[PDB]
Design a protein around this ligand. Sequence first.
Ligand SMILES: Nc1ncnc2c1ncn2[C@@H]1O[C@H](COP(=O)(O)OP(=O)(O)O)[C@@H](O)[C@H]1O
Ligand SMILES: Nc1ncnc2c1ncn2[C@@H]1O[C@H](COP(=O)(O)OP(=O)(O)O)[C@@H](O)[C@H]1O
Lengths: 50, 50, 241, 149, 128, 48, 50, 50
Amino acid sequence: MNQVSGLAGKESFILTRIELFNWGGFHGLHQAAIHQDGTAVIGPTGSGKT
Amino acid sequence: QTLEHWLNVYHEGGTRLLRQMEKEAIGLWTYPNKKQYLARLRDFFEVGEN
Amino acid sequence: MNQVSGLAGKESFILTRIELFNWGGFHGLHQAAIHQDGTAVIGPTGSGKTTLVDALMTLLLANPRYNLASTGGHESDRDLISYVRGVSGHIARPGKTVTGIAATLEREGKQVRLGALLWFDSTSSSVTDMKRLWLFSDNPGQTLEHWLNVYHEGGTRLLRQMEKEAIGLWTYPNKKQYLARLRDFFEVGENAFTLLNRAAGLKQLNSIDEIFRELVLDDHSAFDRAAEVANSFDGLTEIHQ
Amino acid sequence: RKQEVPLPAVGVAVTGIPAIERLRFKEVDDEAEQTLDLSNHAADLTQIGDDFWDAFNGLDREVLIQQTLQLLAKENRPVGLAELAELLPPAHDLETFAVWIGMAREAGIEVIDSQREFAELSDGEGRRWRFNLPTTGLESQALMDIDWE
Amino acid sequence: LGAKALLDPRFRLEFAVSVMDRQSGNVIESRKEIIASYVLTASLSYALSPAGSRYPLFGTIILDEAFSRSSHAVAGRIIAALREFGLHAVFITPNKEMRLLRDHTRSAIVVHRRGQNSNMASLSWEEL
Amino acid sequence: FITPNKEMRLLRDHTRSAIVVHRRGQNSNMASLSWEELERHYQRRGNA
Amino acid sequence: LGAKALLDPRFRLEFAVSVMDRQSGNVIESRTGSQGGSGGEKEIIASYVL
Amino acid sequence: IPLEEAIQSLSSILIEHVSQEQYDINQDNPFLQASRELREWIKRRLIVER
Ligand SMILES: Nc1ncnc2c1ncn2[C@@H]1O[C@H](COP(=O)(O)OP(=O)(O)O)[C@@H](O)[C@H]1O
Ligand SMILES: Nc1ncnc2c1ncn2[C@@H]1O[C@H](COP(=O)(O)OP(=O)(O)O)[C@@H](O)[C@H]1O
């Protein structure tokens, strides 16, 4: 399942961290990494994902 | 350079300092209008707006 | 949780059973049961659950919003004739086809049943090529498969003749008079079953106000009056000019 | 371009008579600083409801399907649902029963709703139950002829 | 919305709901999910109750996708309210949030569709 | 992948991380977790 | 729909995706239009195209 | 070329020619140089922008 991810990170640029501040409901500073094997945003419906 | 650094500099000094920082720094660029920044981006990533 | 459910049946009529025949994908006789303390219909997405909901609803309104939930505003691709034909997108039952539906209930342990018998005698599917009947029974001695056999003995006249043979049985060729009979049997105004249709396809609860509007209350907006208002005003304008 | 044309002065506006009184001065007395916020808002997940952890803990049809196939290879015979419960008592009972009937019907095998079989199962809090089940039979052949995706 | 405000009776007024103390009748709240379900059950029960009848004579209600779009506590409140209104209820879901319904229901009907064919298999259970 | 609560089961296997977001009325938070740590957090909630 | 069918380029064309055999020019199966209730294949084809 | 894209690309190009010792070397702001020279070429009617 997860073995196909060698290519990522060798040719292309890869998002790996989004820092936010006073953006939407995210009062104050926030930070979240993204694992270069593919990451998923999870949360209760209506919880700032979009 | 990180969002923390930029916010800290902005608090330490208004827009004047924010625009002055570019020339002091290296590997950094600022764009008081968006389309300039988007052109910089599209150039760096070699892809059209489409 | 459910031990307080003792009021069901003892106090009011509740759903107990359903039967089907040559309806949708349910080719031939097919059946289900219902529990007093409640039940749930389950299955993989797009497997026949809302199909059963529509099959039930066909007998309780002038016309329900067939496939109301999954459409999400989309028009009712499903309806009576397509269900009798078993449509998907290849018609399951072309030519001459027969069909039967029923539901059941109980109050004080005494049974009630609804149903309707449909069939095209030709491959065409006009609204009149459909030969239809509706039924209502307050006697346990009635079931859907028995009605199918009765039809196999003869046409609608036989479904009326067995009504005359038994007591606590009613059948009708026109939907409105059957609906009126059942509604009198429950004192129910048809707006109640309209609300039932509103609920039977409602998705997530958006807001209490919008819920009042879209479920509790009939729309009945007067835009139909505005058209003739404008036309009559233009007519007056003609003479005035 | 910047030659001065001789046009009359009309719409002649007069403004800004420089009365000394109109002056006012920088009121820097608003000294209160706006505090900085550079705190990492480390979050604990225990504040969102069980509706999320439940979907986290839910059943997976793949794992149970493979386990049932292993069992049916072991027994190598038709087996009823109650025996399937006894051999493989689940945790999420009703869903597992639904999956079992789903396989039964994926094989095209008849499920005689008209004749029944029964079982008893405990749950995660020690409470016990009874299941009125329909009669049918699963077979390793049935589910290897069928495939899953 | 303006055309609704002019031609739609429903838009001539804004609906509201208030929580009441049972004994003294004092207002605790003047105003979602927990209340809307009770609202809907109330509306159906009343619409299905003949004049002068304490109960809804036709006490059965259907809910498509009843709880595939609601939290656990919300569906618990739904079933509680249905008990308050003496309404037998039926629910539909595509094999999701099944723990709740299995806990709060005593039977179910599974439907699977093999190509153009469909069929039914009923089931039941109880606690001990 | 942005995902709802449903179908998270399948997605858990075919990825290596999760950005969990929080709703607190008129406030929100967000944290970076791996499935290994989210499993342990679920266990901690089960214990407390 | 009529007006776009005239004055919008990308509305004069119907689109369909035909699966090809690597070892033959034949079409294994073509996907487009209303499926009628089954979409286990349409989903993957459309996602793949996107 | 959209004007902003053009000035960005021209600044990137002129960055290359900073090595030409005998032609107007800029090593403080090539972006402003690109802007000024695009304007100049517009003055010569080499390039007209609409
Ligand atoms: N127009 C809005 N309506 C409701 N909430 C809003 C709105 N705009 C911003 N919000 C705030 O930002 C969020 C926007 O909705 P969101 O939860 O991000 O969508 P989803 O959860 O489906 O991804 C809300 O959770 C809320 O905190
Ligand atoms: N009368 C009809 N018209 C069109 N399609 C129908 C009709 N009857 C059944 N179908 C098919 O039968 C299946 C019904 O599954 P169902 O679970 O009731 O729908 P959903 O899960 O989307 O709410 C669907 O695959 C549907 O396409």
